[PDB]
Amino acid sequence: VTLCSPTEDDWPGMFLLAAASFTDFIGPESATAWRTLVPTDGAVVVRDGSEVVGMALYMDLRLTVPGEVVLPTAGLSFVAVAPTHRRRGLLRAMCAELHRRIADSGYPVAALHASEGGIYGRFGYGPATTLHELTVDRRFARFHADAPGGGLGGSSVRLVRPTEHRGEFEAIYERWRQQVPGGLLRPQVLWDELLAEAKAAPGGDRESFALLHPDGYALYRVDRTDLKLARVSELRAVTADAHCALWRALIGLDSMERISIITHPQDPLPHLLTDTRLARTTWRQDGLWLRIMNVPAALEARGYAHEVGEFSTVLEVSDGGRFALKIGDGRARCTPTDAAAEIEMDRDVLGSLYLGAHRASTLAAANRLRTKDSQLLRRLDAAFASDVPVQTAFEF
Amino acid sequence: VTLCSPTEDDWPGMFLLAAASFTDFIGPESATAWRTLVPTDGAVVVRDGSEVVGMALYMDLRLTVPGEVVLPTAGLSFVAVAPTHRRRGLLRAMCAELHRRIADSGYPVAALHASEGGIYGRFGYGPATTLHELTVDRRFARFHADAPGGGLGGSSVRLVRPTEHRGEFEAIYERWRQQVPGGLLRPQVLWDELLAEAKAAPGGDRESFALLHPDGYALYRVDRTDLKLARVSELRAVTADAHCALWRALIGLDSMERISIITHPQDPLPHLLTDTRLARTTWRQDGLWLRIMNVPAALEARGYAHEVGEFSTVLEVSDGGRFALKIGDGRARCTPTDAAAEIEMDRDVLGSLYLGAHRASTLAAANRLRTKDSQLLRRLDAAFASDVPVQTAFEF
Amino acid sequence: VTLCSPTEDDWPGMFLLAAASFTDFIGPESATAWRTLVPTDGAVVVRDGSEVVGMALYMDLRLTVPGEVVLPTAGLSFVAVAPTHRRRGLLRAMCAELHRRIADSGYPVAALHASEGGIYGRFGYGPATTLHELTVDRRFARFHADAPGGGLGGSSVRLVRPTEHRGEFEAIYERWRQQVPGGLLRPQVLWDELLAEAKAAPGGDRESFALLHPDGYALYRVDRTDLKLARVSELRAVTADAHCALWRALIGLDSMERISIITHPQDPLPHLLTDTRLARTTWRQDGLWLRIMNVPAALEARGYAHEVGEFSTVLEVSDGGRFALKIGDGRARCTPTDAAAEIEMDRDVLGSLYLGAHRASTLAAANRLRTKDSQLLRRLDAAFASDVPVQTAFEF
Amino acid sequence: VTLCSPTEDDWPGMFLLAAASFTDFIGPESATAWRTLVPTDGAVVVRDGSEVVGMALYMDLRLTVPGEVVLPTAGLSFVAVAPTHRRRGLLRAMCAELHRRIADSGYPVAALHASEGGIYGRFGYGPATTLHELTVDRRFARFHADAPGGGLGGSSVRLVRPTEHRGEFEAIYERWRQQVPGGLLRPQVLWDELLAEAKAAPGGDRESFALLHPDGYALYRVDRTDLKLARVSELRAVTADAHCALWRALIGLDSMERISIITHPQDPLPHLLTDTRLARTTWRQDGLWLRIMNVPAALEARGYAHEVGEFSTVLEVSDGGRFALKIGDGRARCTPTDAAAEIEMDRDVLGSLYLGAHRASTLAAANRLRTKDSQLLRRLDAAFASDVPVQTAFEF
Ligand SMILES: CCN(CC)CCNC(=O)CSc1nc(N)c2c3c(sc2n1)CCCC3
Ligand SMILES: CCN(CC)CCNC(=O)CSc1nc(N)c2c3c(sc2n1)CCCC3
Ligand SMILES: CCN(CC)CCNC(=O)CSc1nc(N)c2c3c(sc2n1)CCCC3
Ligand SMILES: CCN(CC)CCNC(=O)CSc1nc(N)c2c3c(sc2n1)CCCC3
């Protein structure tokens, strides 16, 4: 049981573990595209004696954080331990080695999507975005008098084939990801993969269609089994006008009973309708998880709310350092100190605060965040909050 | 078809309409208790020719708003139109008369719980609290190392019969309702009714039990049909310690698979567990709806966030007046003006902002709130936000 | 194993067999009411050695047949064989004795509601009415421009308590039953029983309400478990205006999603709506079964369609006689003959034709009815058809 | 937004709208076959500016009406409005243009299958056939002593592969469609398509088998997911003997629990069994919809019941003309008149009466058909009734 960077000859063994560990695994062909995002020493495997019994890697990503700042991000992925080798310290050993490499390589943050919610907290990852499924019973849906784009004349939205308008989706997404916390750069190879999933599969998913606006798009397909349900896989809108116009078109899918989408808690859709209740929350879950690798770099890199007045405090991260944190004029300065801590929290908690999805006050109430000053709590809440609601880009 | 205040002889007809309109109607005996909260001219009926074909009333309530300010509140309730008399203007006529009476009587706000979400917006009511059902699979639930009250020694929580500890529930609730936005005074007659519902009914609900802490309680019963589900009807906790200790006791209901509760979006429960995902959101809906009757009085009465610096603007409510709004040092001044509006919104939108459940930014994105200044938007968001998360007291 | 008329001392044993044989059995108290409809020698029991192991009886009923003719009808009921004594000839023996008594007493027809559809054909009973369940999704239901009673002014329908308007229901039902084939006289004791079932039961059925028009009524209650479903137990309407007005009121039950009713195949409800499809047929089944006891008397007693021109034929009923049947001017003459048969059928088939629910042509296609002349077939179809659609009165 | 006949270059855009509008759409290959039934100017499209945002067409069909008369019929089909262009008058505009073309081309009737039941009434289409799903629990099914084809010797029914007996199916269907109201000529290209659907699809429908009699056939396949359910896609039988023999063979599918078929309300199947109840009606819906284009031509073309004696009346169709209607000896004469109307109805109502699926009396009770003479009503009922029960041929 030794731990190594994989060679080319290890990858058939890694794909076998992948097929056995991940039910949603698309085979080796699609893996080629994703592999191009893995840097030279971005992967570790565990061999027994040899067969691959453990693997983990990270991908080079670009993540937007509040203030429209783009951080280099290590995207943990393809993590698997063979069912033959559970409870053997393998996950801990692989995660430790990758975090060492990630830290040394100079990434300020790491990120992942969690298969289970009970695993990654102990390795310093905190849930940082919230997925929110809305299901609209579109048969009752009427738009409010106040909703944009309800005037006479032609529609600005076109119904199109995804593969024939790649350039427009790319450009709209690029604009979206740069202005929204949680945004990820989507490289060319992932557009290739996305548009491949758009066509129908024999005994699989139905054909995808697109609704295209100059400042937004929606990709949707009819569900495999529920033929009265349309699933919006992705809706990206840069303006409120685009968002409303796309939803006017989706509600116009008259052969459907229900439209579902995985969105974020601050999606304005409910408020566009005369009956807000028709946009039912059918599902909620953690989206992106963040591990802050370098506390000073991460805290100094993001923007903070201009509304809160300048304040200073001392933050201790458990086994992560202690810092003099000064926030004012939407910027933070974060420097070493041995002064008494005013705020303590584990590393995972900081990840949860970092994009503004969770309030300091809420985490304080669970005692995941410890302070004796409730004024400081309010100031943290306000400072770390995000002007632009945090969203989830794409799963990896 | 005339509109009158009911006499004693109208009430049998009103109870008949009630039994036919409300499936959850407890009969005339329980109605006696609720009736004591209806003031002298708090009710209207419509007769044909005579039989009661329409009714509506309000109750005298006390509602806590941000800054722990308690407002006299007209609680609209018992609203019904006979199925024989739909689409006849009756709801509009009854609501107009009651709003006249409520306004003239000097209530700054009216409030209701909505049977449907598409009805009450046009009468100036906006959803102001959010109900959030969490279902915990308690078989997997483990408390985080950081969670309070996990030390050795005895428990501070007692398992008791509700009817034998009325005084303690009353006193704990009184403390709770005064410090939480959305809190309602629960008068003696509603405690009588609550503790009557606590006992088992033949072929109905099972017996209720209570978990009692010095600074919190939980009332729960096993579900009628799903005998592995415990439903928490009510949990009131004044400290984080009480909240955690009550949840340690609920997770200790070892004969149950699942514990469900209707709570609020900022309930810290998920953060008390090592796996936040185990607290699944199974249901979300509008709670209390508010109609601001008097804009200046309401806006001046509540507290605002101290974090945001002093600012001035001009607010227009559609057919509700235009006001110079000045907010600073957590207080607002709201005075008449004919200066150009910087913010416009319908009356219902203001109700939705008033307890801090919805962000101005979110409503702006749906164009329910119109301004040309995005800095002003951020300032409104921050100012109207509530330090203490808004919760829902009891349905009426 | 002997067969006797029961004495008073046999009835506790009969109630025991009843409770064990019929899940819907209301106990001995309600049985008192039904017992008053059983004539002196209207019942048979089988004892072993003694305990009651078999029973059957008939009740004195009055049944409306086409031409608004009311026949004395033997209503077979309370038929049961102990589970200890199956496959022992007991049903055959009891049915033979009762049919002897019924014939000798001078009833032209016997009738029953069948627990199973495979039992009663061999004893000469044919299904003669069709039950048709319609479920309306009332949220989408809009009335057609052509539908009666859509004008301004007050409603003619009142929402009332059943027990306070007994006289009006009685009188409306009396008018209904006399003008509709399948109508049964409902005696006073069955009104007592019907209005007793109208009140709520602890852990049972919910309270019943009534919609009352001068020329019709509907009795309905919310379903026990599906609280968005209203079940119409009974709707009796003497005019099209009443029928439409009652349905306008039922569609006005705004707290319900669905209204269901057990009606007949020619219920005009679907045609009152702009979307006929909203009245979905969710269930179909045989209603009343008829055994023609005396062929000549039965065939001469009913009216026939005036449209078909006079014709003569020879009808043979298998082991039931052969007859010269002459039909003209809406009347039949039916006399003995030994002339060659032009039409043959079993006795059960004639029962199925008798109220016009089934077409001769349809039964001919199954070869349940044999003739070599297709012109005769068309003439039978037309002659036996009912001007007024056949309906089902009440179960017994 | 202009309205044109499509060119060859419009058809890729039409197929895109089709794939997005119709979930059951087989792609462009199968569309080639259906296209051959569309005449030169049988189609309209709406372009914006260009992309296809609206389309509609008709196909040249031959429809059998009572009296075995075959009418040229315009089969409306492939109707779709883009979800981006709802509530824009497009359906109304396309339907108006096609009806103009259909009328001018000399079709007496148009016909369609309705995606929803609330759409096509306002354009003068009335539901004219009823689909009736029967589900037989074949484990209990026993044939009645009277049922044909229960004697000793060999079976007349063969189990075969559909594709190897095309000629026999074609010839049997041709005989069927010519003698049954609702029958449609099935051209060669639709036989090609039907037999292509008969083979198994990977992750789709299972292989179809055929039961073949000299005077009937049944096509059936095991359901995708319910492997104890056999679905009869099509059963065509020219004699009662064939119908019974095919059902004896279907009940002999001993590996199945249930056989389902979409048939018509007068299917004799229930009467072939000792227990009629085993043939449960699981589903009912409108089949073919008719719009009478030319009232005189349509009414003069069909045969009427010989049983009713000669009578004369005056029929007014709303915005469709007024006519002296004389019916006798199974033929109608229909000529212009300005004499006072004795019968009024909308155009859609006449379509519903035309094949005898709905009774005049029933439509009168809903006030869709207005007369003051109830004798006239009875005469219409009898006259328009169909000797041969109306059935549904194939969907288009
Ligand atoms: C399949 C992994 N899955 C289960 C935990 C996680 C969620 N992933 C997705 O939703 C997009 S599909 C995908 N994603 C990759 N990161 C990858 C990688 C591949 S294939 C591939 N496919 C090869 C090496 C780089 C990572
Ligand atoms: C039954 C009304 N229901 C349906 C819309 C609304 C929700 N109400 C509850 O969840 C508590 S039960 C209750 N509530 C009342 N306000 C009242 C009133 C009564 S009984 C009564 N019971 C008589 C007059 C004052 C209001
Ligand atoms: C209970 C019998 N049931 C099961 C086969 C048949 C259907 N009957 C009903 O839907 C009305 S309840 C009823 N009906 C009776 N005929 C009777 C009789 C009684 S109780 C009674 N209750 C005593 C003797 C006369 C018949
Ligand atoms: C797909 C249309 N569908 C949805 C409303 C209606 C029902 N149609 C069927 O059940 C047989 S499949 C079919 N039918 C056509 N008429 C057509 C036509 C095609 S493909 C085709 N396929 C191209 C032009 C002529 C009509």
Swiss-Prot record, chains A, B, C, D:
PANTHER family: N-ACETYLTRANSFERASE EIS (PTHR37817:SF1). It catalyses: L-lysyl-[protein] + acetyl-CoA = N(6)-acetyl-L-lysyl-[protein] + CoA + H(+). Is potently inhibited by several small-molecules that share an isothiazole S,S-dioxide heterocyclic core. Some of these inhibitors, when used in combination with KAN against resistant M.tuberculosis, efficiently overcome Eis-mediated KAN resistance by restoring the antibacterial activity of KAN. Some of these compounds also inhibit in vitro acetylation of DNA-binding protein HupB. The Eis monomer consists of three regions that are assembled into a heart-shaped molecule. This shape is formed by an unusual fusion of two general control non-derepressible 5 (GCN5)-related N-acetyltransferase (GNAT) regions and a C-terminal region. The N-acetyltransferase domain of Eis is responsible for its modulation of ROS generation and pro-inflammatory responses in macrophages. Residues 1-148 form the N-acetyltransferase domain. It is an enzyme of class 2 (transferase). InterPro entries: Acetyltransf_17, Acetyltransferase_Eis, Acyl_CoA_acyltransferase, Eis_dom, GNAT_dom, NAcTrfase_Eis, SCP2_sterol-bd_dom_sf. One of its GO terms (biological process) is biological process involved in interaction with host. Its EC number is 2.3.1.-. Pfam families: Acetyltransf_17 (PF17668), Acetyltransf_9 (PF13527), SCP2_2 (PF13530). The gene is eis. Effector that is released into the host cell and affects host immune responses; it negatively modulates inflammation, macrophage autophagy, and cell death through redox-dependent signaling. Acts as an acetyltransferase. Acetylates 'Lys-55' of dual-specificity protein phosphatase 16 (DUSP16)/mitogen-activated protein kinase phosphatase-7 (MKP-7), a JNK-specific phosphatase; this leads to the inhibition of JNK-dependent autophagy, phagosome maturation, and ROS (reactive oxygen species) generation for enhanced intracellular survival of M.tuberculosis. One of its GO terms (molecular function) is identical protein binding. The active site is at 120 (proton donor), 396 (proton acceptor). NCBIfam families: PRK01346.1-1, PRK01346.1-4. The keyword Acyltransferase applies. This is N-acetyltransferase Eis. Disruption phenotype: No significant difference in terms of intracellular survival in U-397 macrophages and in an in vivo mouse aerosol model of infection. A strain lacking this gene induces more TNF-alpha but less IL-10 production in primary human monocytes than wild-type. Macrophages infected with a M.tuberculosis eis-deletion mutant display markedly increased accumulation of massive autophagic vacuoles and formation of autophagosomes in vitro and in vivo. Increased expression of eis due to point mutations in the promoter region of eis is responsible for resistance to the second-line injectable drug kanamycin in a number of M.tuberculosis clinical isolates, through acetylation of its amino groups, which leads to inactivation of the drug. Acetyl-CoA binds at residues 79-81, 87-92, 115-116. It is found in: Secreted; Host cytoplasmic vesicle, Host phagosome; Extracellular vesicle, Bacterial extracellular vesicle; Host extracellular space. Homohexamer; trimer of dimers. It comes from the Bacteria. GO terms for cellular component: bacterial extracellular vesicle; cytosol; host cell cytoplasmic vesicle; host extracellular space. Keywords: Acyltransferase, Antibiotic resistance, Host cytoplasmic vesicle, Secreted, Transferase. Belongs to the acetyltransferase Eis family.
